[PDB]
Write a protein that binds this DNA or RNA. Structure first.
Length: 290
DNA sequence: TGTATGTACAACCGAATTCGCGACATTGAAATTTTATATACGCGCCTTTTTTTTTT
């Protein structure tokens, strides 16, 4: 129907042998030892790029162990998509893995990392006039958008408008794929159907988030004061969602009871633009507002 | 299998809020106030006078 293992596919790739699985040729001269069958990547004290290695593993996968001697390696599809969305060169990570990881890069592990680096979305969701539309940087993308009931049918025929792509981006498609390619401006209504049809037909689309196509108007009555409590995970989570230069809303999985709304109020203020806040239930809306 | 939950849509209720007549106080003023003097009357009232009455 509309369920994707790729988001929740984390929890596998830890099984190897000893007869078929050979000691990694880098095992003699390799700062790490990538156990590809066990999916474990032990980052011992001998890795000089352990900080560089530690960050790369955290993107493509989840480091289960962070021991003082060596770390531990786990596989995460959301990490794989996140490490795919990380943007590190799939080949470049593998080789520094291969050279660093004494255990040779596993064949299945090597494919997933490259599959991370490039896949985790090869979709072609084009955008017009700084907005989202039914198009694609790649051709199979324009076909997906045009043949889309929500992307195409919900897409206005106009190729792109500075204001329409600005305003409408058939809802807000501020999460589309590569823009500045062939596409048509989509309406102001219903990206559920856009996503509910890329749902039904399994279109993993290499998506972005165009955060000042979070423009949306003359500036609202927002008091851009940072007097709301600021404490360090929120800001670097903000620094992650503020990214380079200007406020991008990402997905930032935050706890209710540790100042969750605090990042939202800042990002809402930072854009200096109209923003709505949605909480669980209305009674919690007052509690949270209280 | 018992229960916790968000949200509704409709009739009930009392709570809190702003308008002019009466009380006098106001200053404005006239009236009254005191005095001389002739006039003459008619108020009342003073003392004295005379009369009457009582008691021895």
């Amino acid at each position: 129907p509309a369920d994707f293992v790729p988001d929740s596919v984390s929890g596998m790739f830890r099984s190897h042998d000893f007869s078929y699985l050979r000691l990694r040729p880098d095992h003699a001269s390799r700062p790490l030892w990538i156990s590809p069958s066990d999916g474990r990547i032990i980052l011992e004290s001998f890795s000089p790029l352990a900080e560089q290695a530690q960050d790369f593993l955290v993107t493509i996968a989840e480091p289960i162990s962070r021991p003082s001697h060596i770390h531990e390696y786990k596989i995460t599809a959301y990490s794989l998509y996140a490490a795919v969305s990380v943007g590190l060169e799939t080949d470049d990570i593998i080789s520094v893995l291969d050279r660093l990881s004494k255990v040779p890069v596993a064949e299945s592990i090597i494919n997933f990392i490259k599959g991370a680096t490039i896949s985790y979305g090869k979709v072609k969701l084009v955008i017009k006039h700084n907005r989202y539309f039914v198009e694609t940087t790649q051709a199979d993308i324009l076909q997906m958008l045009l043949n889309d009931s929500v992307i195409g049918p919900l897409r206005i025929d106009s190729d792109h408008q500075v204001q329409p792509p600005e305003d409408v981006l058939e809802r807000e498609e501020e999460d589309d794929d590569i823009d500045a390619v062939h596409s048509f401006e989509i309406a102001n209504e219903s990206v559920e159907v856009v996503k509910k049809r890329c749902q039904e037909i399994d279109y993993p689309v290499l998506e972005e988030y165009d955060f000042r196509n979070d423009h949306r108007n003359p500036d609202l009555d927002i008091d851009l004061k940072p007097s709301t409590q600021i404490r360090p995970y929120q800001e670097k989570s903000l620094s992650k969602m503020f990214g380079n230069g200007r406020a991008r809303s990402g997905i930032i999985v935050l706890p209710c009871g540790a100042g969750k709304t605090l990042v939202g109020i800042t990002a809402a203020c930072t854009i200096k633009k109209s923003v709505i806040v949605l909480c669980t239930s209305s009674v919690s809306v007052m509690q949270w507002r209280q």
